[PDB]
């Protein structure tokens with residue numbers, strides 16, 4: 036039984052406060068921490084901020100913390116809920132807020148309670164978190180599937196100062212035989228990239244963005260891609276490493292057009308692209324580089340653009356801001372054949388139950404699912420256990436630099452070790468890892 | 472009783488492998504992870520690397536890990552050691568290696584077990600880590616002293632690409648009334664700094680170095696310091712925030728002189744300074760800025776330069792590479808009056824026991840002690856509990872950006888909360904926190 040529910044303010048990877056929750060049971064104290072995005076889709080569940088410009092630059096979470104402590108806590112403990120019953124847990128929480136967007140208590144007040152209960156339940160059951168998550172999701176566990184890590188080695192958009200519009204340039208070692216191998220390979224590529232980047236664009240170019248990737252000040256995707264393929268080759272991994280993109284196009288969508296100079300306050304409107312024009316740009320990239328996944332190619336409500344591009348795209352198309360880990364939205368995307376992959380962010384929806392449903396619905400439609408961190412991460416490692424539980428075969432949790440990234444990557448090495456032969460590595464089967 | 476000793480490879484904050492150790496007892500599994508420096512002193516205990524250029528660029532730790540699993544492990548379990556007896560743990564470890572610089576086993580193999588044992592001990596005693604650390608160290612806990620966090624908000628030297636020679640530019644909110652306040656103020660200064668830096672030196676200048684500080688490509692310390700001052704004022708914390716420096720001068724000491732353009736392969740030898748000329752620069756900075764602490768002003772063996780400068784310094788002078796957390800070297804520095812504070816790094820010496828001895832010897836000499844992370848950190852939080860346990864009153868564990876940094880800072884917030892009125896904040900008494 037839950038004897039205490041408590042929250043506190045802690046700091047994220049960027050130096051902004053976030054919510055940390057602890058749940059106490061007869062099994063101990065279970066702690067979960069809420070992540071925070073930067074390029075947040077307009078449809079995400081509410082992240083409650085204090086908005087007091089005089090403290091934390093207006094980003095405190097005292098209100099959210101207070102909602103946990105003064106609203107949720109006593110009520111939750113009184114309720115005497117069965118932590119093992121995730122659904123019951125989330126039902127209680129959702130009910131307590133009573134809003135569609137969790138704007139009453141805030142998504143960042145709900146989430147940590149949701150996640151912490153799951154940790155508690157795993158403890159009650161005496162099983163590892165990933166196994167409990169496979170249980171809650173009714174996922175197959177024989178064998179378990181370890182994900183290919185999509186490492187964001189070169190950062191742009193809203194994640195790094197510089198002119199580069201596209202947000203993320205990831206490498207995925209789909210050719211590795213094990214997760215450990217993939218991580219080694221990814222780290223080697225990363226070091227080579229850092230060195231080539233300083234050489235080609237200047238010492239400052241090697242300094243990092245929010246997600247740990249290098250941050251050269253360049254105007255085009257080709258300049259980033261060229262560096263990456265060069266790094267793969269220098270590292271000796273040609274053919275084992277593929278590329279993924281996160282366009283985060285909503286960040287540059289204005290006036291029905293797409294601004295690839297969006298970070299320039301005086302950007303030339305005459306240069307903004309139409310949806311078709313942008314699609315042609317992407318096709319150029321696809322034909323040239325070993326890109327196997329493109330995320331958020333069009334804006335979060337630009338349905339027609341997505342559907343149109345989708346019929347011509349011969350690779351994984353990931354929905355992020357389009358879907359916001361929301362089953363309702365996913366259903367729209369599925370019917371419209373807008374994408375074939377969901378980017379899963381527990382904090383975009385606010386509860387673990389909802390997130391799991393999002394995953395299930397996606398898998399039911401033949402889509403893939405890439406579990407993801409936020410640009411504002413913490414020392415929390417939930418998502419590592421989550422992507423294994425969910426059997427997705429793919430995760431994005433950063434470059435192999437900045438510990439809020441490595442913490443998940445390290446957790447995955449521990450999981451692998453623990454499972455041994457009871458797990459396979461998704462490798463080239465990443466898209467449908469759940470069906471392995 | 473310890474039933475198992477095990478080690479595995481994990482990744483540090485820069486993407487390099489490091490050693491992670493787990494000790495299993497009646498109480499559970501206790502994990503400790505080893506950090507890795509960049510600007511490592513020539514006299515530091517040996518960090519064992521594999522040197523297989525085909526794997527991790529030669530940076531693997533498989534040998535060290537194998538040392539723990541195949542050499543330390545069996546002997547250690549067989550010995551049936553009392554984890555609560557830290558000296559016995561350490562003597563055992565030291566003796567097993569039998570080398571002056573822990574080059575047989577590797578200091579990175581030894582340290583993980585040393586630390587993991589202390590965590591095991593604390594659990595056996597049913598006390599929080601920091602309390603056990605206070606016990607091991609014969610420290611006073613009534614009250615405990617929370618440290619002033621020295622935040623490395625602007626990075627240079629070997630920690631960030633760019634021209635800037637001195638390594639670190641730290642802010643220290645000695646005017647805060649609580650640790651939580653100090654951290655808030657610090658973060659706010661940091662945000663103001665990032666924005667000012669992008670404006671003054673360009674967008675890329677806001678990207679970060681290894682320790683999470685902003686990384687402007689500037690030639691001089693005054694340029695860095697002006698930014699900091701400007702940020703402090705902008706944040707509204709004028710008078711509550713002081714400055715600390717880490718010169719890491721050994722990194723630019725060549726042919727008996729100091730190269731302030733050491734990262735330029737075509738640096739002007741005619742511009743390299745002598746010890747006295749360097750001291751002149753320091754005095755000028757100290758006059759101009761609210762600097763309360765200077766670390767590694769002169770090279771690791773340039774005794775006379777230290778000795779001379781110290782005569783008229785008048786602020787805290789921290790020894791890092793000069794002492795390498797080594798009591799023998801500390802004895803010298805005390806004898807020559809070279810400095811008045813020790814930078815404490817468990818991995819410079821290799822055992823918790825020798826590190827506690829170093830601290831004790833320092834405090835006994837009237838010196839201060841600043842507990843420190845390495846530039847290559849992990850999600851491990853040991854140092855947070857250590858600084859509190861040793862009651863030093865001061866720690867440096869990065870900018871309030873990059874979770875390998877926030878993890879510690881968050882842990883101190885937790886400790887502070889736990890302690891409540893049983894603890895005081897060092898504030899302006901940071902130098903002699905132990906005597907508070």
Ligand SMILES: *O[C](*)C(*)(*)(*)(O(*)(*)P(*)(*)(*)(*)(O*)(O*)=O*)C(*)(*)(*)(O*)=O*
Nearest residue numbers: 072073074075408409410
């Ligand atoms: O890379 C994670 C996420 O960025 P946020 O967290 O929204 O700034 C993305 O868009 O995939």
Ligand SMILES: *O[C](*)C(*)(*)(*)(O(*)(*)P(*)(*)(*)(*)(O*)(O*)=O*)C(*)(*)(*)(O*)=O*
Nearest residue numbers: 508509510511844845846
């Ligand atoms: O900032 C910590 C340390 O840097 P390393 O770890 O040696 O690269 C220093 O010199 O104080």
Ligand SMILES: [Mg+2]
Nearest residue numbers: 072073074075
């Ligand atoms: Mg986003």
Ligand SMILES: [Mg+2]
Nearest residue numbers: 281330331355
């Ligand atoms: Mg995205």
Ligand SMILES: [Mg+2]
Nearest residue numbers: 508510511719
């Ligand atoms: Mg150093």
Ligand SMILES: [Mg+2]
Nearest residue numbers: 717719767791
């Ligand atoms: Mg130093």
